[PDB]
Short mmCIF file of all heavy atoms in Angstrom, two decimals:
data_model
loop_
_atom_site.label_atom_id
_atom_site.label_comp_id
_atom_site.label_asym_id
_atom_site.label_seq_id
_atom_site.Cartn_x
_atom_site.Cartn_y
_atom_site.Cartn_z
N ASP A 1 118.90 120.91 105.77
CA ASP A 1 118.33 122.18 105.46
C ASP A 1 118.82 123.28 106.44
O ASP A 1 118.91 124.49 106.09
CB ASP A 1 116.85 122.07 105.34
CG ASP A 1 116.33 121.12 104.27
OD1 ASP A 1 116.93 121.25 103.23
OD2 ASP A 1 115.34 120.33 104.53
N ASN A 2 119.00 122.91 107.67
CA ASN A 2 119.45 123.77 108.77
C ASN A 2 120.88 123.75 109.07
O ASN A 2 121.40 124.43 109.81
CB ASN A 2 118.66 123.54 109.94
CG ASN A 2 117.14 123.79 109.79
OD1 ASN A 2 116.72 124.59 108.98
ND2 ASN A 2 116.38 123.06 110.58
N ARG A 3 121.64 122.87 108.28
CA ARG A 3 123.00 122.64 108.62
C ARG A 3 124.01 122.76 107.27
O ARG A 3 123.64 122.09 106.29
CB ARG A 3 123.34 121.27 109.21
CG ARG A 3 124.69 120.67 109.23
CD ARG A 3 125.29 120.87 110.52
NE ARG A 3 126.50 120.13 110.74
CZ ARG A 3 126.68 118.94 111.18
NH1 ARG A 3 125.50 118.33 111.65
NH2 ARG A 3 127.74 118.32 111.36
N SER A 4 124.95 123.59 107.35
CA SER A 4 125.82 123.85 106.19
C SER A 4 127.28 124.12 106.69
O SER A 4 127.53 124.42 107.87
CB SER A 4 125.37 124.91 105.37
OG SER A 4 124.06 124.78 104.77
N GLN A 5 128.19 123.67 105.79
CA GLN A 5 129.54 123.90 105.88
C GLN A 5 129.90 125.01 104.89
O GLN A 5 129.71 124.82 103.67
CB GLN A 5 130.52 122.75 105.76
CG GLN A 5 130.56 121.82 106.97
CD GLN A 5 131.52 120.73 106.87
OE1 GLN A 5 132.21 120.64 105.83
NE2 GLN A 5 131.63 120.02 107.93
N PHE A 6 130.75 126.08 105.21
CA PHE A 6 131.13 127.06 104.35
C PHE A 6 132.62 126.99 104.43
O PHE A 6 133.24 126.72 105.42
CB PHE A 6 130.66 128.53 104.79
CG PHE A 6 129.10 128.62 104.90
CD1 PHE A 6 128.44 128.26 106.00
CD2 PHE A 6 128.49 129.03 103.83
CE1 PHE A 6 127.07 128.41 106.06
CE2 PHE A 6 127.05 129.18 103.80
CZ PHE A 6 126.37 128.87 104.88
N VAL A 7 133.15 127.27 103.24
CA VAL A 7 134.67 127.17 102.99
C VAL A 7 135.17 128.51 102.45
O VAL A 7 134.78 128.79 101.23
CB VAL A 7 135.13 126.05 102.13
CG1 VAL A 7 136.60 126.09 101.86
CG2 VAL A 7 134.83 124.71 102.86
N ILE A 8 136.00 129.27 103.13
CA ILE A 8 136.60 130.37 102.53
C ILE A 8 137.98 130.11 102.22
O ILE A 8 138.77 129.75 103.28
CB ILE A 8 136.51 131.64 103.48
CG1 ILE A 8 135.05 131.98 103.96
CG2 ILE A 8 137.20 132.87 103.07
CD1 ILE A 8 134.89 133.14 104.78
N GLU A 9 138.44 130.03 101.00
CA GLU A 9 139.73 129.66 100.57
C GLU A 9 140.08 130.31 99.17
O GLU A 9 139.16 130.52 98.53
CB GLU A 9 139.87 128.21 100.56
CG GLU A 9 139.21 127.48 99.49
CD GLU A 9 139.65 126.09 99.24
OE1 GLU A 9 140.73 125.69 99.78
OE2 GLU A 9 139.03 125.37 98.36
N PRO A 10 141.34 130.60 98.97
CA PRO A 10 142.52 130.54 99.85
C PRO A 10 142.65 131.88 100.66
O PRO A 10 142.38 132.99 100.12
CB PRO A 10 143.66 130.32 99.00
CG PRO A 10 143.17 130.89 97.61
CD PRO A 10 141.71 131.00 97.62
N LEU A 11 143.00 131.67 101.92
CA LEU A 11 143.28 132.89 102.70
C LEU A 11 144.91 132.95 102.93
O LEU A 11 145.63 131.98 103.06
CB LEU A 11 142.62 132.83 104.18
CG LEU A 11 141.14 133.01 104.13
CD1 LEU A 11 140.63 132.71 105.48
CD2 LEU A 11 140.70 134.49 103.83
N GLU A 12 145.35 134.25 103.06
CA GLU A 12 146.73 134.38 103.31
C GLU A 12 147.17 133.87 104.67
O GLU A 12 146.31 133.71 105.51
CB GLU A 12 147.17 135.91 103.39
CG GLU A 12 147.04 136.48 101.88
CD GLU A 12 147.61 138.03 101.81
OE1 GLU A 12 147.54 138.62 102.89
OE2 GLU A 12 148.11 138.38 100.83
N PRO A 13 148.38 133.39 104.87
CA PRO A 13 148.84 132.63 106.04
C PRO A 13 148.38 133.30 107.39
O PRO A 13 148.73 134.47 107.48
CB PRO A 13 150.23 132.35 105.89
CG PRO A 13 150.50 132.35 104.43
CD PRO A 13 149.57 133.38 103.91
N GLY A 14 147.63 132.66 108.23
CA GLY A 14 147.29 133.23 109.49
C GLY A 14 145.88 133.64 109.54
O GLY A 14 145.34 133.92 110.52
N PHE A 15 145.28 134.14 108.39
CA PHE A 15 144.08 134.77 108.41
C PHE A 15 142.86 133.90 108.60
O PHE A 15 141.74 134.48 108.92
CB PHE A 15 143.77 135.56 107.05
CG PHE A 15 144.36 136.95 107.10
CD1 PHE A 15 145.67 137.40 106.64
CD2 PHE A 15 143.50 138.06 107.66
CE1 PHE A 15 146.03 138.62 106.65
CE2 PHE A 15 143.97 139.28 107.73
CZ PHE A 15 145.12 139.55 107.23
N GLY A 16 142.96 132.57 108.46
CA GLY A 16 142.01 131.68 108.93
C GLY A 16 141.66 131.92 110.32
O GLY A 16 140.33 131.79 110.83
N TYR A 17 142.70 132.04 111.23
CA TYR A 17 142.34 132.41 112.55
C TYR A 17 141.91 133.79 112.78
O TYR A 17 141.33 134.17 113.92
CB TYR A 17 143.62 131.94 113.38
CG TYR A 17 143.88 130.49 113.28
CD1 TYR A 17 145.01 130.09 112.56
CD2 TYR A 17 143.24 129.63 114.09
CE1 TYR A 17 145.30 128.73 112.50
CE2 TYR A 17 143.47 128.15 113.97
CZ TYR A 17 144.39 127.80 113.24
OH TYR A 17 144.73 126.49 113.17
N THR A 18 142.23 134.75 111.95
CA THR A 18 141.68 136.15 112.07
C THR A 18 140.23 135.97 111.90
O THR A 18 139.49 136.54 112.73
CB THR A 18 142.22 136.98 110.91
OG1 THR A 18 143.70 136.71 110.78
CG2 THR A 18 142.07 138.48 111.34
N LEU A 19 139.71 135.30 110.91
CA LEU A 19 138.28 135.38 110.57
C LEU A 19 137.54 134.40 111.50
O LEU A 19 136.43 134.53 111.76
CB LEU A 19 137.95 135.15 109.08
CG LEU A 19 138.80 135.89 108.07
CD1 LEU A 19 138.23 135.73 106.61
CD2 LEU A 19 138.79 137.44 108.42
N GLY A 20 138.14 133.26 111.85
CA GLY A 20 137.48 132.10 112.47
C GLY A 20 136.62 132.41 113.77
O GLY A 20 135.54 132.19 113.75
N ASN A 21 137.43 132.82 114.76
CA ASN A 21 136.77 132.95 116.07
C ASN A 21 135.81 134.14 116.06
O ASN A 21 134.71 134.14 116.65
CB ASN A 21 137.75 133.08 117.16
CG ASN A 21 137.22 132.81 118.60
OD1 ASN A 21 136.31 131.85 118.71
ND2 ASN A 21 137.53 133.57 119.50
N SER A 22 136.06 135.21 115.33
CA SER A 22 135.20 136.31 115.23
C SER A 22 133.85 136.02 114.41
O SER A 22 132.86 136.44 114.95
CB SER A 22 135.86 137.50 114.46
OG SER A 22 136.84 138.06 115.50
N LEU A 23 134.15 135.24 113.44
CA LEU A 23 132.80 134.75 112.64
C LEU A 23 132.05 133.73 113.47
O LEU A 23 130.77 133.86 113.44
CB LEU A 23 133.16 134.20 111.31
CG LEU A 23 133.51 135.02 110.15
CD1 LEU A 23 134.02 134.25 108.94
CD2 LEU A 23 132.31 135.79 109.87
N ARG A 24 132.67 132.89 114.30
CA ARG A 24 131.90 132.05 115.20
C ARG A 24 131.12 132.79 116.20
O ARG A 24 129.94 132.57 116.34
CB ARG A 24 132.75 130.94 115.72
CG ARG A 24 132.07 129.99 116.76
CD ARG A 24 133.00 129.02 117.29
NE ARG A 24 132.30 128.18 118.20
CZ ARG A 24 132.03 128.43 119.47
NH1 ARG A 24 132.41 129.53 120.05
NH2 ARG A 24 131.22 127.59 120.29
N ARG A 25 131.81 133.58 117.05
CA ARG A 25 131.17 134.37 117.99
C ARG A 25 130.12 135.30 117.39
O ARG A 25 129.07 135.59 118.05
CB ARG A 25 132.25 135.10 118.86
CG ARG A 25 131.62 135.88 120.15
CD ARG A 25 131.27 134.96 121.13
NE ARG A 25 132.63 134.20 121.63
CZ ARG A 25 132.75 133.67 122.86
NH1 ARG A 25 131.56 133.57 123.64
NH2 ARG A 25 133.81 132.91 123.20
N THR A 26 130.31 135.81 116.26
CA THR A 26 129.33 136.68 115.56
C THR A 26 128.13 135.90 115.23
O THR A 26 127.00 136.30 115.53
CB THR A 26 129.94 137.43 114.46
OG1 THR A 26 131.14 138.14 114.77
CG2 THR A 26 128.94 138.35 113.76
N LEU A 27 128.44 134.86 114.54
CA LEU A 27 127.16 133.93 114.18
C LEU A 27 126.42 133.47 115.44
O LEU A 27 125.16 133.50 115.51
CB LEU A 27 127.75 132.59 113.48
CG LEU A 27 128.19 132.84 112.04
CD1 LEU A 27 128.85 131.57 111.63
CD2 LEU A 27 126.95 133.04 111.18
N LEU A 28 127.04 133.21 116.55
CA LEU A 28 126.36 132.78 117.76
C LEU A 28 125.59 133.98 118.38
O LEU A 28 124.40 133.87 118.64
CB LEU A 28 127.26 132.08 118.63
CG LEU A 28 127.76 130.74 118.29
CD1 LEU A 28 128.93 130.24 118.99
CD2 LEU A 28 126.75 129.72 118.28
N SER A 29 126.30 135.08 118.80
CA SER A 29 125.79 136.02 119.77
C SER A 29 125.26 137.32 118.95
O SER A 29 124.62 138.13 119.69
CB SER A 29 126.96 136.54 120.58
OG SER A 29 128.00 136.96 120.01
N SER A 30 125.53 137.53 117.65
CA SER A 30 125.29 138.85 117.01
C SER A 30 123.92 138.72 116.21
O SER A 30 123.56 139.74 115.67
CB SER A 30 126.36 139.29 116.21
OG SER A 30 127.26 139.77 116.85
N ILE A 31 123.24 137.65 116.09
CA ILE A 31 121.93 137.48 115.20
C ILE A 31 120.80 137.59 116.25
O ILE A 31 120.60 136.81 117.00
CB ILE A 31 122.04 136.26 114.39
CG1 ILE A 31 123.31 136.01 113.79
CG2 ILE A 31 120.93 136.30 113.45
CD1 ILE A 31 123.43 134.85 112.95
N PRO A 32 119.90 138.63 115.91
CA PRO A 32 118.83 138.75 116.79
C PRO A 32 117.67 137.71 116.54
O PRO A 32 117.44 137.36 115.36
CB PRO A 32 118.17 140.12 116.54
CG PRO A 32 118.72 140.36 115.14
CD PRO A 32 119.96 139.75 114.93
N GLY A 33 117.18 137.13 117.55
CA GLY A 33 116.02 136.13 117.41
C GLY A 33 115.14 136.11 118.57
O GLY A 33 115.43 136.91 119.54
N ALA A 34 114.18 135.36 118.56
CA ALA A 34 113.14 135.29 119.66
C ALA A 34 113.08 133.87 120.44
O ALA A 34 113.34 132.93 119.74
CB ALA A 34 111.70 135.62 119.13
N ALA A 35 112.72 133.97 121.68
CA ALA A 35 112.61 132.73 122.41
C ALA A 35 111.75 132.92 123.73
O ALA A 35 111.18 134.09 123.77
CB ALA A 35 114.03 132.27 122.82
N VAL A 36 111.64 132.00 124.45
CA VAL A 36 110.81 132.03 125.63
C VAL A 36 111.61 132.61 126.82
O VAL A 36 112.60 131.98 127.17
CB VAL A 36 110.20 130.64 125.98
CG1 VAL A 36 109.41 130.69 127.23
CG2 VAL A 36 109.52 129.96 124.77
N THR A 37 111.21 133.59 127.37
CA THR A 37 111.81 134.25 128.45
C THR A 37 111.44 133.61 129.83
O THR A 37 112.22 133.28 130.74
CB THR A 37 111.53 135.65 128.58
OG1 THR A 37 112.01 136.44 127.54
CG2 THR A 37 112.12 136.34 129.81
N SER A 38 110.07 133.35 129.99
CA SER A 38 109.55 132.72 131.29
C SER A 38 108.19 132.03 130.88
O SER A 38 107.56 132.26 129.97
CB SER A 38 109.43 133.71 132.36
OG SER A 38 108.48 134.71 131.90
N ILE A 39 107.79 131.19 131.71
CA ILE A 39 106.60 130.33 131.76
C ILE A 39 105.91 130.34 132.98
O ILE A 39 106.57 130.59 134.06
CB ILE A 39 106.76 128.89 131.18
CG1 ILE A 39 107.50 128.02 132.27
CG2 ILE A 39 107.54 128.90 129.95
CD1 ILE A 39 107.47 126.61 131.89
N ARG A 40 104.65 130.12 133.13
CA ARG A 40 103.94 130.05 134.27
C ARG A 40 103.05 128.68 134.10
O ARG A 40 102.15 128.72 133.23
CB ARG A 40 102.99 131.17 134.67
N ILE A 41 103.12 127.69 134.99
CA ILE A 41 102.31 126.50 134.87
C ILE A 41 101.23 126.56 135.84
O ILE A 41 101.43 126.78 137.06
CB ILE A 41 103.19 125.18 135.10
CG1 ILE A 41 104.39 125.26 134.12
CG2 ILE A 41 102.44 123.96 134.93
CD1 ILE A 41 105.26 124.08 134.28
N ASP A 42 100.00 126.28 135.46
CA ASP A 42 98.85 126.36 136.31
C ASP A 42 98.88 125.15 137.23
O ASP A 42 99.14 123.92 136.80
CB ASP A 42 97.52 126.36 135.54
CG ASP A 42 96.25 126.68 136.45
OD1 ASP A 42 95.97 127.78 136.90
OD2 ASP A 42 95.67 125.54 136.80
N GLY A 43 98.47 125.26 138.39
CA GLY A 43 98.41 124.18 139.44
C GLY A 43 99.70 123.97 140.24
O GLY A 43 99.61 123.33 141.23
N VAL A 44 100.69 124.59 139.89
CA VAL A 44 102.04 124.43 140.60
C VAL A 44 102.65 125.78 140.69
O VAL A 44 102.97 126.45 139.58
CB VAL A 44 102.98 123.34 140.02
CG1 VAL A 44 102.92 123.53 138.44
CG2 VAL A 44 104.33 123.55 140.53
#
């Protein structure tokens, strides 16, 4: 449900590497989301 493979084909020769690393770095770093910045544990 959280895991998928996408296939973009056919691409003109060389363009798989045009789109590939930019799409990977975009997917990773360009999507806004929320997470835990810091925590404080009582007793320590």
Side-chain angles (χ1 to χ4, degrees), residues 1-39 41-44:
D1 294 322
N2 303 326
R3 166 98 167 265
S4 293
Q5 282 191 357
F6 302 88
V7 173
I8 302 185
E9 68 164 354
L11 289 171
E12 292 190 330
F15 267 98
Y17 297 103
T18 321
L19 312 189
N21 199 40
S22 290
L23 275 178
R24 176 180 182 274
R25 186 76 61 164
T26 304
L27 283 168
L28 291 167
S29 58
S30 281
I31 312 183
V36 181
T37 297
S38 61
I39 71 173
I41 303 180
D42 185 85
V44 43

